[PDB]
Design a protein around this ligand. Sequence first.
Ligand SMILES: Nc1ncnc2c1ncn2[C@@H]1O[C@H](COP(=O)(O)OP(=O)(O)O)[C@@H](O)[C@H]1O
Ligand SMILES: Nc1ncnc2c1ncn2[C@@H]1O[C@H](COP(=O)(O)OP(=O)(O)O)[C@@H](O)[C@H]1O
Ligand SMILES: [Mg+2]
Ligand SMILES: [Mg+2]
Lengths: 48, 520, 546, 191
Amino acid sequence: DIRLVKKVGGTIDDTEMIDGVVLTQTAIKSAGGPTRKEKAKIGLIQFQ
Amino acid sequence: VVFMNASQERTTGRQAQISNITAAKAVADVIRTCLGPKAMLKMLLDPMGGLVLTNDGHAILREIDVAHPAAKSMLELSRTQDEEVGDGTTTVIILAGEILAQCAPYLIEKNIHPVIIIQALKKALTDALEVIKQVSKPVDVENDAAMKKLIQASIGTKYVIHWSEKMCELALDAVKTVRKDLNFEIDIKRYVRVEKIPGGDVLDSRVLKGVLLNKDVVHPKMSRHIENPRVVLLDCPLEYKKGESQTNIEIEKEEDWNRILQIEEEQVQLMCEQILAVRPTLVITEKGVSDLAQHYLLKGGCSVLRRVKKSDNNRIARVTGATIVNRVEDLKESDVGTNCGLFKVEMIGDEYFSFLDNCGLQKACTIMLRGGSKDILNEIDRNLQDAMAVARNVMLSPSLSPGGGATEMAVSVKLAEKAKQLEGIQQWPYQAVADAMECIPRTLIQNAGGDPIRLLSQLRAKHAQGNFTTGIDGDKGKIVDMVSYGIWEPEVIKQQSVKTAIESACLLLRVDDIVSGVRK
Amino acid sequence: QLFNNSRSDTLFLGGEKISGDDIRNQNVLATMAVANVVKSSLGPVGLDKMLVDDIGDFTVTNDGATILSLLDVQHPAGKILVELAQQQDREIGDGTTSVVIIASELLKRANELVKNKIHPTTIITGFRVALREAIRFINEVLSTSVDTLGKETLINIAKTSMSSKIIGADSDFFSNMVVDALLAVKTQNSKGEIKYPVKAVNVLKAHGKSATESLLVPGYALNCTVASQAMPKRIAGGNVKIACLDLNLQKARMAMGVQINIDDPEQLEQIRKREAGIVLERVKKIIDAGAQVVLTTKGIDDLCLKEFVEAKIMGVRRCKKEDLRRIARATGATLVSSMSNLEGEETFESSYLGLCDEVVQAKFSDDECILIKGTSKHSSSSIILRGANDYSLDEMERSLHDSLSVVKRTLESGNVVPGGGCVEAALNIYLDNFATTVGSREQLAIAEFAAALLIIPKTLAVNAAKDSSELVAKLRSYHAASQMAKPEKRRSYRNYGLDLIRGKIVDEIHAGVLEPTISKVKSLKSALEACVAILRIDTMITVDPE
Amino acid sequence: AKQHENRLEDKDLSDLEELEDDEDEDFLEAYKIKRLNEIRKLQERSKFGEVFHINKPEYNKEVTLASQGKKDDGGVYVFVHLSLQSKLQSRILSHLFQSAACKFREIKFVEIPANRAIENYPESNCPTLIVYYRGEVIKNMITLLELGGNNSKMEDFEDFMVKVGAVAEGDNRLIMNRDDEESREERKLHY
Ligand SMILES: Nc1ncnc2c1ncn2[C@@H]1O[C@H](COP(=O)(O)OP(=O)(O)O)[C@@H](O)[C@H]1O
Ligand SMILES: Nc1ncnc2c1ncn2[C@@H]1O[C@H](COP(=O)(O)OP(=O)(O)O)[C@@H](O)[C@H]1O
Ligand SMILES: [Mg+2]
Ligand SMILES: [Mg+2]
């Protein structure tokens, strides 16, 4: 339940507990429609 | 425990600069005798085996692989000068070498910093463009008689000065054809075609406005002489195009296999009928042609030529005004080319040649050069590239300057006086720029066989009187004014030379360490 | 150093074993061996270098970012400085040459503290209290960004980034270029936060006239060739529509599954026609929309080129993904991956097209570039660099690319500080009085930390081939009086540094050289974190490859 | 020396027609008849083209007899796949067989479940790729970690077929040699 995500960059002093679940992977940016979301409903797709 | 796979040892300090400046002097020594009208020729042995006989600076440097990395900055200046203008390549190398050779005994002797020299060259370059603007003047661009002597200036160094009366008319008609109205002269060398035909005589030549193809007609019934031809350009093959989807037809009945080959004949029949919808007389295609399609075009007299290059189709389009259309359905009377004439196929035993001639201001032509060997055809072909290269700048800008060492001497006489005013530390390298312009006049004199110490001594006193058009003759070595003879070049060649020479010196003077072994 | 140690005496390791102060000395020589190539490249008086790849190819480079990346070092202690040079290029984009020299001297000057039986834990603690005391002093000595009635700042910021380059003499001309470029490509995000995307401007490798006559484009310049030669090159008139497509426009097959199997051969030609027709129906509606200029990521087949030549449309193949987002962002269009909508029908709307004033294709020394200028919705910019050859322009490309990052930071953070080793000399006077207050063993750590910071102004004089102690002693004298300034402006003897072209100490504000304070912050922490990584190592265990 | 050989060796029957106007007819058509005969041999050898989902009694014939072919040593390569639907690599390798089957019709592509192949063979061991030729096992390949594992691609599978002698190096059907038409189009323009 305690995941340690390694991101190369910055300094150790910037390390702080994130309130929510941080994702390691980046976005696709093939279309690049949305920029910043607010009050979003998250879903987990397992199919293709 | 080497700590470095790429040259853990180092050659630092002043010894790296000795290797740099001495290498910059060596590349100029092998082409010092390649200037002036009495210049000699060179031969290069490429590893592929194709020999070439060259005197232009760009062809010498590009075919010589050099192991010294600091020298390679000098090798690329003729490449930069070639693509920008195409004339005056040799002056950039020797001028850059004299600037580096004259600036050598200042870090060794005076211990002046390089960055102070960088400031000195920019102020000298600023004054160099100022006095070149003062020495230059405008002339009339539309006078065809005036354009002949300007094209003859660059031709005088090359071998074809003996045919300068023919070469000026050969190049002047060609550059005016591709020229159009609209940087006010947007025509490009890519539109100009030059086909090299071994054999013949260089005196017999003409500027034909067309596209010379190097192949024969595909069927013997076709007439090789058309009075009023009609050109139609195509990209689709006359053969049956195979689909990239991969399909399997399973034939279980009996009439299906016969109907497929009948549909193949019906498709070529329907395809050829749409070609005849606008009843052309000459068809051009960049792909193959089936033997089935040749028969149906005999009734219409549509002469077909196949496997034509993509660039040649564009050159055919600009001459005849035809539009390149892939599909055969979109053929209209406007798509068909017009105002073409004199379609004739001259029989030569080597290869078949077909001519074209005219009666959307972009135009093109094909200069058919005749000679005695394929290597000297490349020489005359490169002289044609130099013949039109000097003509573009006089057409682009009306500005014009003298040459033959006079314009370079005018920079030194003005710059020496400016150094005399300069007063400080930067005045020591500022004097080196004034002394660096003396190599060109000197080189010309030395090649001519004169005594440069006394010829240039009186030239200093001659320019001190207040004249700028006084140069040095290349044959006998007089101090006669160039207004009588007519040695004149554009201003863009000398502007690009002093700019590229100064900018190349700034690149190479700021190097202190040499390393290798990276293997990127 | 002297001799090789015994190989696994009663230890039974397959590799090598070494311990003691010998490896600690090897790390110092390792950091100094890789730092010597960075020494001569520091400051405006530094000279460039060239790296040969043993294939004839060479590249001229001044900054230590890509030099150390190209130099393949096998010692792992040197790899941290190699990655430190690459790390500083990503975040800050300037000062890669300084962190290597600062990190090497902190380890070199701390090497004397090792044999004094001072533990490294006490040494780094004395360095860290000196660090946070130095950051607060940097936060006190910083200045505002107004300074006068006019701006008079961004032109001077470019000179610091442009110094020590081949075009440092032409920085007066290029200073106006970089400030006009980044002010055109600004954006809006996070409800009022302004951003400046670095590398968004197009740096073209052109050859020709000179670096002084480099014309600034008032708009984006696409580096690609025209498909056909019979097309119109110049398109005049206002409100030129820009179409940005990415779907596959050349003739392609049906999907993997579909296998055309035919029994009645009559429709075999019809399926061939519709496969050739279905790709032209897309081109038909673009002509109905009236897009003068169309750009495609993928190729363009000859079946599509005939329609563009007939209708006088500018079709360009072989575009890249990252470019077309900036074209659509600048010209006001939107990126179209495929033509469809929420409804079942398929069509194309005119709202997807952009707008620009003029589009002209220009060629200069075998470099065809499409000049798109006059974007209505948002402005754009591109810089056409001109020089001797491509390898000389790579130094200019890195010189411009580092200049955008420095001018990015002074606008994101208005706080700046003067160059010429001013803050490096000011921290020494501040830390000497603080070193005596703390008392115990950390005095030597804080003191030697301050002595290592003086290497930046010393290297400016050593590479200048002048007397260094006189300039350092005069810079020491003025900074010594700054702490004892006796406030009541008359707070003088501050904000001074070295002037190398004349060899005097003058005011850096009037001279016109500045640097953002955030570069000093991240460089000091990243240099000390690298120093912590090397000091804490005791014994090496090198395992040979199987 | 190679410049004369590249005219004929580096051009198929479709590409040899480019030199019809340039080169001599007798020099060109003499080689086109040779290359045309080679194309006819591949059509006669195209006895396959889809994955043969077999069962064991048959293995003793399909896998091995085929490997003998005409037995003129007309050998035939037979790629067997001990499939296991629970494993992720097995379904990837099944897709590569059908893709390669549509291209290489002369090579036989065989598939069978691994549980039905060998008595109590470890489930972990499969996906197993065996290559028979003239009755002899040329390669007993283990799970696809050698071929990238989960990230296996069609290019890696075609490269393996060249190593075992199933496909020639300079074959026009291989993706390494089958350059795109847009690639060759740019070469002619920049030439
Ligand atoms: N007969 C001549 N008399 C005086 N000067 C000449 C004569 N022929 C050539 N020159 C000078 O030599 C120069 C040679 O130019 P050119 O051969 O076109 O390129 P490059 O200068 O690179 O050799 C010209 O600029 C011209 O001023
Ligand atoms: N004109 C100048 N006068 C005095 N010092 C300068 C000048 N230009 C740069 N410097 C000094 O050089 C240091 C590093 O310069 P920088 O531009 O980062 O070099 P590089 O571009 O090679 O990384 C700065 O800390 C600054 O103090
Ligand atoms: Mg010349
Ligand atoms: Mg910098």
